């Protein structure tokens, strides 16, 4: 009830994805990537209009490896972190693990390699929606909220610092 409204509020304007394909699925994967880029770019364009342009992502030729940056603003200071992840073979049933390698071991809510610990509520929400959610949804529902909890906590603990 409140959980559905919370999800719909956060992702309502992100194009939904269609194609149930992973990295090895040839022409279906090429179509999945079109959907992924279509969703990511609309998300960014929406983020710009809302003065919340908070990440850049790109893939390799095959779309098996993604990398870019996210930005978090705290008390008017902008923190930039490099991000990267591999697409699992069983994607998009299986959610990718976003790695922020520079924050590795600096918070408990994180596995080895700076793979962010994705909440017990977010994983089944992804599971129920398959294959409608893509990387745009993973950023909006996964990394977005994680940064809004961990970046402030890390700045306060003095373990993360500001660069020009």
Author numbering: 0 to 163
Reproduce, without paraphrasing, sentences from the article in which this PDB structure was first reported.
Analogous to ubiquitination, ufmylation is carried out by a three-enzyme cascade involving E1, E2, and E3 proteins. The E1 UBA5 has three distinct regions: (1) an adenylation domain that binds ATP and magnesium ions; (2) a UFM1-interacting sequence (UIS) spanning amino acids 334 to 346 that holds UFM1 in a trans binding mechanism; and (3) a UFC1-binding sequence (UBS) from 392 to 404 that binds UFC117–21. The adenylated UFM1 is then subjected to a nucleophilic attack by the catalytic C250 of UBA5 to form a thioester bond with the C-terminal glycine of UFM1. This is followed by a trans thiolation process, whereby the UFM1 is transferred to the E2 UFC1 forming a thioester bond with C116 of UFC1. However, UBA5 does not harbor such a domain but instead has a short sequence called UBS that is responsible for the interaction with UFC128.
To further understand how the UFC1 double mutant (Y110A and F121A) affects UFM1 transfer to UFC1, we determined its crystal structure to 2.2 Å resolution. As expected, the double mutant kept the overall UBC fold as observed in WT UFC1 with an RMSD of 0.3 Å2. The main differences were concentrated in the loop harboring the active site Cys. Specifically, Leu 117 Cα moves 1.7 Å away from its position in the WT, and its side chain points towards the position of the missing phenylalanine (F121A). This movement is not feasible in the WT due to steric clashes with F121. Then, to understand how these conformational changes affect UFM1 transfer, we examined our model suggesting that UBA5 Y372 utilizes a cavity on the UFC1 surface. To that end, we measured the volume of this cavity in UFC1 WT and double mutant using CASTp40. While in WT this cavity has a volume of 377 Å3, in the double mutant it becomes 126 Å3. This change probably hampers the ability of UBA5 Y372 to occupy this pocket and therefore affects the recruitment of UBA5 linker to the active site Cys. Taken together, our results suggest that changes in the cavity volume of UFC1 due to the double mutant interferes with the ability of UBA5 to execute its role in desolvation, and accordingly, increasing the pH helps to overcome the defect in transfer.
